[PDB]
Design an enzyme around this catalytic site. Structure first.
Site, mmCIF file in Angstrom:
data_model
loop_
_atom_site.group_PDB
_atom_site.id
_atom_site.type_symbol
_atom_site.label_atom_id
_atom_site.label_comp_id
_atom_site.label_asym_id
_atom_site.label_seq_id
_atom_site.Cartn_x
_atom_site.Cartn_y
_atom_site.Cartn_z
ATOM 1 N N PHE A 27 34.918 44.647 46.372
ATOM 2 C CA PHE A 27 33.935 45.683 45.999
ATOM 3 C C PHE A 27 33.326 45.535 44.595
ATOM 4 O O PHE A 27 32.301 46.165 44.294
ATOM 5 C CB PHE A 27 34.583 47.054 46.062
ATOM 6 C CG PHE A 27 35.703 47.201 45.103
ATOM 7 C CD1 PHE A 27 35.449 47.501 43.763
ATOM 8 C CD2 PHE A 27 37.008 47.010 45.507
ATOM 9 C CE1 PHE A 27 36.474 47.539 42.865
ATOM 10 C CE2 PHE A 27 38.040 47.103 44.622
ATOM 11 C CZ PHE A 27 37.772 47.372 43.286
ATOM 12 N N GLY A 28 33.960 44.742 43.739
ATOM 13 C CA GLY A 28 33.593 44.673 42.317
ATOM 14 C C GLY A 28 34.851 44.643 41.483
ATOM 15 O O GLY A 28 35.820 43.977 41.842
ATOM 16 N N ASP A 143 42.733 52.097 54.753
ATOM 17 C CA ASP A 143 42.957 50.875 53.963
ATOM 18 C C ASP A 143 44.127 50.940 53.023
ATOM 19 O O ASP A 143 44.061 50.539 51.841
ATOM 20 C CB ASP A 143 41.680 50.510 53.208
ATOM 21 C CG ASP A 143 41.617 49.001 52.801
ATOM 22 O OD1 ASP A 143 42.376 48.127 53.294
ATOM 23 O OD2 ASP A 143 40.766 48.728 51.966
HETATM 24 C C1 LIG Z 1 41.332 46.026 42.417
HETATM 25 C C2 LIG Z 1 42.596 46.550 43.062
HETATM 26 C C3 LIG Z 1 42.726 48.048 42.906
HETATM 27 N N1 LIG Z 1 41.712 48.742 43.674
HETATM 28 C C4 LIG Z 1 41.178 49.893 43.256
HETATM 29 N N2 LIG Z 1 41.632 50.404 42.158
HETATM 30 N N3 LIG Z 1 40.964 51.583 42.019
HETATM 31 C C5 LIG Z 1 40.967 52.558 41.061
HETATM 32 C C6 LIG Z 1 41.763 52.554 39.829
HETATM 33 C C7 LIG Z 1 42.279 51.364 39.358
HETATM 34 C C8 LIG Z 1 43.034 51.323 38.212
HETATM 35 C C9 LIG Z 1 43.269 52.486 37.499
HETATM 36 O O1 LIG Z 1 44.002 52.382 36.362
HETATM 37 C C10 LIG Z 1 42.762 53.682 37.953
HETATM 38 C C11 LIG Z 1 42.013 53.721 39.110
HETATM 39 C C12 LIG Z 1 40.102 53.491 41.556
HETATM 40 N N4 LIG Z 1 39.559 53.109 42.759
HETATM 41 C C13 LIG Z 1 40.092 51.946 43.006
HETATM 42 S S1 LIG Z 1 39.971 50.711 44.232
#
Ligand SMILES: CCCNc1nn2c(-c3ccc(O)cc3)cnc2s1
Length: 337
Positions: A27-28, A143
């Site tokens: 996703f980025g 997911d």
């Molecule tokens: C890239 C793997 C993790 N994937 C995602 N992390 N996150 C996060 C998130 C990641 C690290 C943080 O400190 C706080 C929030 C929010 N939405 C998503 S999708």
């Protein structure tokens, strides 16, 4: 393109100074920032690819999190807190509370070692409670995987362990939150045929039989076993092999599901079309084995965990344990007064 705007020192929205990258996905990416408005507090900012698929997911996530964060403002149910969103050089950016490492990254950095059982118990309980809150609100995550379960704080202590002749990290606080609501689907919305990351994907999803909340319970079972063993239990990238791994660990698929699926390519005369004596076949047979043979101890607490996992990995979603029932399972008794 994203590269150009996600660098250390860049300022987003005249407010958030990037410190560095926390993680990256299809996703980025997610970066840690200093929030100069809020006195320097650190936050996480998710920068979304400027690609239709991910923009649409990001917009859907924003809706879902406004709903969840309003219904549960104190995060009693441990969904991540979204703070705000904005646009930066054409990219949607979503600001969240800053958490620690994902459970996946923790395992990876610890040399693919498992968590201790007392930690698994606490983490499982919180994952079930959190996802059950979604299920109570007509939502399915779709997911769940260890990358999407994050420690609130991932600090650890580290000492030489003579038994395994290596240094080893011990997690201090196993509290978690659930992230990534871009695929979360309401009961009355359109259900895509394909959901979940492959390794956590339920058999009803692989067989395109229709899915709902039970597919999340399957994913959780897969997560728990991975926390117990330190490795992904279905690591393949091929659907038929995945199903062959399932049959070796859990037994044959139910006949009625096989008969109902439109994925005929996997099957021949209502049996998985899988040569056990081919090379892939012998690998699956020697690498995979019945679920209970993975147990590292016969202690009753391990038996309790495996009973719960076995119930979550029920093939038929109509018979699979619900999260409401899972929260009352004996494995969790030690958590209760
Ligand atoms: C890239 C793997 C993790 N994937 C995602 N992390 N996150 C996060 C998130 C990641 C690290 C943080 O400190 C706080 C929030 C929010 N939405 C998503 S999708």
């Amino acid at each position: 393109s994203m590269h150009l705007i996600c660098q250390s020192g860049d300022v987003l929205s005249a407010r958030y100074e990037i410190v560095d990258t926390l993680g990256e996905g299809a996703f980025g990416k997610v970066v840690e920032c200093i929030d100069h408005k809020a006195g320097g507090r650190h936050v996480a900012v998710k920068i979304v690819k400027n690609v239709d698929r991910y923009c649409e997911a990001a917009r859907s996530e924003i809706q879902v999190l406004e709903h969840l964060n309003t219904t549960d403002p104190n995060s009693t149910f441990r969904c991540v807190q979204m703070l705000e969103w904005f646009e930066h050089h054409g990219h949607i950016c979503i600001v969240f509370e800053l958490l620690g490492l994902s459970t996946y990254d923790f395992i990876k950095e610890n040399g693919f070692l498992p968590f201790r059982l007392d930690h698994i118990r606490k983490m499982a309980y919180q994952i079930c409670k959190s996802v059950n809150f979604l299920h109570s609100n007509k939502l399915t995550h779709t997911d769940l995987k260890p990358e999407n379960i994050l420690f609130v704080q991932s600090d650890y202590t580290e000492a030489y362990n003579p038994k395994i002749k290596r240094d080893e990290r011990t997690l201090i606080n196993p509290d978690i939150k659930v992230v990534d609501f871009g695929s979360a689907t309401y009961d009355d919305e359109h259900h895509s045929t394909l959901v979940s990351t492959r390794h956590y994907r339920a058999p009803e999803v692989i067989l395109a039989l229709g899915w709902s909340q039970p597919c999340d319970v399957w994913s959780i079972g897969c997560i728990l076993i991975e926390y117990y063993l330190g490795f992904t239990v279905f690591p393949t990238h091929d659907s038929k092999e995945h199903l062959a791994m399932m049959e070796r660990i859990l037994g044959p698929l139910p006949k009625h599901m096989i008969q109902k699926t439109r994925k005929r390519k996997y099957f021949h005369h209502d049996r998985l079309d899988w040569d056990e004596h081919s090379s892939a076949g012998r690998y699956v047979s020697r690498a995979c084995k019945p679920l209970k043979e993975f147990m590292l101890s016969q202690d009753v607490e391990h038996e309790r965990l495996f009973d719960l996992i076995q119930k979550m990995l029920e093939y038929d979603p109509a018979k699979r344990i619900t999260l409401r029932e899972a929260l009352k399972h004996p494995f969790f008794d030690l958590l209760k007064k």
